Every structure is written in C-alpha cells, then in structure tokens.
Amino acid sequence: ALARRLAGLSPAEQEQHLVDMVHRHTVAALQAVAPLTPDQVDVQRPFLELGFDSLAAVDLHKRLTGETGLELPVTVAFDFPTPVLVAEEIRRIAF
Amino acid sequence: GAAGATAMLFPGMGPAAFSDVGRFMVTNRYTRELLAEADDTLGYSLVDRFRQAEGDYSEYAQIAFLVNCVALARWAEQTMDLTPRICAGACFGEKSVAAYSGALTFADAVRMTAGLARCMDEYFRTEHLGVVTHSFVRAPRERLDEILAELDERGEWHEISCHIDHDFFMLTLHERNSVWLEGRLRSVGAMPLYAMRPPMHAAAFGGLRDKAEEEVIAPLTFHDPTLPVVADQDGKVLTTGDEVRTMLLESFVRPLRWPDVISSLQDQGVTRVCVAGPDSLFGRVGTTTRAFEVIAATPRLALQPR
Ligand SMILES: *CC(=O)NCCNC(=O)CCNC(=O)[C@H](O)C(C)(C)COP(*)(=O)O
Ligand SMILES: [Mg+2]
C-alpha cells in the first residue's frame, strides 16, 4: 500500500516524505511525555536525546506500524535511534 | 481535561537513586517540611542516610520515596490550585495515599513505611531466593496466555504480579525461567523492560502479611481518609481508616490491577490525574494517558524555573 504512494517520487522525495511522517509521529509521541515540546523537532537528533522513554518508543512503533502497515520490530526506536534512520529503515522494508 | 473531577494518584516505587532526587529534596520547602518531621520520627538524618545508602530500594530509599511523593502531592495542589475529589495509590503508592488522605498521621506513615521496608529486607534474606518479577509491554492478553500455558505445562510456579494495561504485565517466577521467558516474549514481538530482584512488587507473600500485621500495622491507628481512596487490588472505593489498613495488608497477597483503578476513577467522574512522585510508568502508560489528562509532579518539574 505504501510502495504505491512512494513510486513516482525521486529517492530524495521519498526520503523527504518518510522523514516528514516519522517526524509527525515523533512529535505526537513526544507530546505525551511533556506537551512543553514544540510542534517541529530536529530529525537528526536521537529520540532519547529529544526526551523519549521506553513507553514513547513503543508508542511511536504503534503509530508507524499503524500508517506504514509494515512489520517493524517493537524496539525500532532503539535499533534506529534518530527519526532519519527510522525513515531509512522503513524504505528498506517497503522495497 | 477540565470537564470533570481531578484525582491525586501516587505511583509505585521505581528504582530511585539519591542522584535523581537529591537537589530537589534539599531545595523544595515541602520536602524540607516533611524531612524534619521524618528525621524527628526516626532519630537519624534521612537525606544523609539515603545519600550514602546502597542499592535502588533501600530502607531509607523507601522512606525518601514517601517524603518526595507526599511533598510533591502538596506542592502540586498549592502551585497549580488543584482540589482532588478522590485519591489512589499503586503498591507503595498505598503508603503515600495513607499519609496524604490523612488515614495516618505522616509520622505513623513514616513508622509504617520503615517497618514494612525492614520486614521485607529480613523476609527476602530466607524466603523467595532467586525469584524475579519481569516487566514487559506489547504482550497482548492472547500472547501472554500462550506463555503462561507453557509454564502450566512445564509446571513452573508463576504469578501475574501487576496488570498494567491490555498488553503490559509484570510476571513473577524463578530466575531459572528468565532467559527462557525473554526468548518467548520477543518471539510474540513483545519487549522485555526490567527484572526486579528480590521481587518486592509481587503479591505471593502470605507469610509476610501475617508478620507485617503483628509487628507494624497493628500498633498504628487509622482515621477515616478526608476523601475516597481507590484500591489497586480491585478498584473498590474505600472511605474508612479500616478499609485503608486492609488495602495495605491485601497488597502482600493481591496483585495490582491498574486498569480496574482507572475504570473505577472514570466511574467516579475523573478527567484529570496528578501523578505525584518520581514516576515513568503510572503517568506515562496508556491505561492512564488514554483516559485522563496527566500532570506528572516529578522532582524534575518542581526544579523547572518559569
Ligand atoms: C506497584 C508496582 O507494581 N510497582 C512496581 C512497578 N514497576 C516495576 O516492577 C519496575 C518496572 N519498570 C519498568 O518496567 C521500566 O523500567 C519503566 C518504568 C516502564 C521505564 O522503562 P524505560 O522508560 O526505561
Ligand atoms: Mg494491592
């Protein structure tokens, strides 16, 4: 289903799109911890640095499993510690 | 959010190191206010004997946790003009709600929290050696029951010690299962979180409950709480010093059912909860965050300048 919406875009536009989505859910997951965090966030900074705990990591994994409809490991936020790397990993799965 | 009553929740004791709460305990005035009442009750310097203590769940770590949660419970009320209509505590939280609800004088609560801490210390030296509580999340009820079935079939003594959420349980059993269990949890695609040892938050200590009643809970004197208290075991709403007394003893033989507490607080028309103390679970987990607008009165939040 994902591969559909991706095909047609440059590799870099697919980067942009995925990084954008993984960002959307990273701020969403980060709002549950301390709503004090802004609406946007530096996608190159590791999650735990931004203020993830174990339960946010598992929260992100639901949201991403949700939208992507893919087999992501529960520990995806730990194994790929920056939004960019989660988007990197998501692409590799979809193809 | 604001469309109903506010509840004051007290969290279960996490692995608290003086390192994490130190500056707050000596800075915050509510803590200093209680620490002085506590030092008087105990006849030693709690902060100094906490600071230089070993471990995560020390005798003095336990007292300190009560001081901090209760202090933060008050701090939150005054600073954020909260007026709770009902309070609740999970496991150790019971000791905190006891003091807060007025059900016990704060000095009695200290005497109690100390007495139990010491009864357990002495208990786990001989009883339940090598037993371990395993926290884990993304283990749906269907997938746990597969693993519990294998333990039944293997004939391995085991106890769900806390129900946290639909897919989040603490499981207490012998450590000879630890590697085995983590193996199966990852198979179903759940994530192991923590191995408690000795298994303090487990609820299979009939032996302890009797000795705790004789030496600690009996000499104490329990007044009716100034507001309803919800019970971790079943979610029942208590209103009598006696019911509180029971709530505390029951926790040696009756596991935490956090869903029931939420379900019950919801029935009591709650929309807002203030989780008072160093928490990272009872304030954060879905069971709470799906149902209520959370206010984590962490020591971090208390030290935040404005
Ligand atoms: C009342 C009661 O049962 N209290 C004890 C509940 N807690 C434990 O058994 C400790 C479990 N701790 C964890 O599972 C994790 O360390 C946390 C607290 C969920 C945080 O995980 P991550 O953010 O490091
Ligand atoms: Mg209990």
Tell me the C-alpha to C-alpha distance, in Å, between residue B161 and each of B32, B169, B242, B248. Answer: 34, 8, 24, 15
- Given a contact cutoff of 8 angstroms between Cβ atoms, the answer to whether B68 and B21 are in contact is yes
State whether the Cα torsion A14-A16-A22-A25 is positive or negative.
Answer: negative
- All structural domains of chain A: 15-94 (1.10.1200.10)
Residue contact A53–B191, C-beta within 8 A: no
Nearest CA to ligand 1 atom 19: B281
Residue contact B137–A54, C-beta within 8 A: yes
Tokens 């293997």 belong to B154
Tokens 């010093």 belong to B241
Paired with B276 in beta bridges are B297
Residue B9's SS3 state is: strand
Closest CA to B229 of B198, B259, B190, B268: B268
DSSP B49-65: HHHT--SSS-HHHHHHH
Nearest chain B Cα distance for residue A72, angstroms: 10
Rounded CA separation B165/B228 (Å): 23
Mapping DSSP onto H, E and C, the string for A25-69 reads: HHHHHHHHHCCCCCCCCCCCCCHHHHCCCHHHHHHHHHHHHHHHC
- Residue numbers in A near B284 (CB within 8 A): 32-33, 53, 55-56
Rounded CA separation B101/B273 (Å): 15
Tokens 């995925």 belong to A18
Nearest CA to ligand 1 atom 3: B201
Q: Count CB-CB contacts under 10 A for residue B257.
A: 20
* For the CA of B162, the nearest atom of ligand 1: 3
Tell me the C-alpha to C-alpha distance, in Å, between residue B103 and each of B48, B226, B238. Answer: 28, 7, 11
Residue B156's SS3 state is: coil
- Residue numbers in A near B193 (CB within 8 A): 54
Instruction: Measure CB to CB from residue A58 to each of B138, B280, B281 and give the nearest one.
Output: B138
Paired with B192 in beta bridges are B136
| Domain spans of chain B, in order of start | 1-123+198-306, 124-197
* For the CA of B11, the nearest atom of ligand 1: 1
Chain B residues contacting A via beta carbons under 8 Å: 137-138, 189-191, 193, 280-281, 284-286, 289
Per the rule left: phi > 0, alpha: psi between -120 and 50, beta: everything else, A32 is: alpha
Task: For residue B254, report the distance from its CA to the centre of ligand 2, in Å.
Answer: 5
**Half-sphere exposure in the Cβ direction for A87 (13 Å, CA):** 22
- Given a contact cutoff of 8 angstroms between Cβ atoms, the answer to whether B9 and B282 are in contact is yes
Stated length of chain A: 95
Closest CA to B10 of B81, B84, B112, B97: B97
* Encoded tokens for B201: 């938050």
Residue contact B189–A53, C-beta within 8 A: no
* For the CA of B284, the nearest atom of ligand 1: 19
Residue B111's SS3 state is: helix
Per the rule left: phi > 0, alpha: psi between -120 and 50, beta: everything else, B45 is: beta
Paired with B5 in beta bridges are B270
Residue contact B284–A33, C-beta within 8 A: yes
Instruction: Measure CB to CB from residue B190 to each of A53, A56, A74 and give the nearest one.
Output: A74
- Given a contact cutoff of 8 angstroms between Cβ atoms, the answer to whether B7 and B86 are in contact is yes
Method of elucidation:
X-ray
The contacts of residue B59 (CB under 8 Å, 6+ apart) are B53, B114, B117, B118, B121
Closest CA to B40 of B106, B118, B98, B100: B106
- Residue numbers in B near A58 (CB within 8 A): 137-138, 191
* Encoded tokens for B244: 């509180």
- Given a contact cutoff of 8 angstroms between Cβ atoms, the answer to whether B54 and B105 are in contact is no
Instruction: Measure CB to CB from residue A53 to each of B280, B286, B289 and give the nearest one.
Output: B280
Tokens 């994994």 belong to A61
- Given a contact cutoff of 8 angstroms between Cβ atoms, the answer to whether B127 and B119 are in contact is no
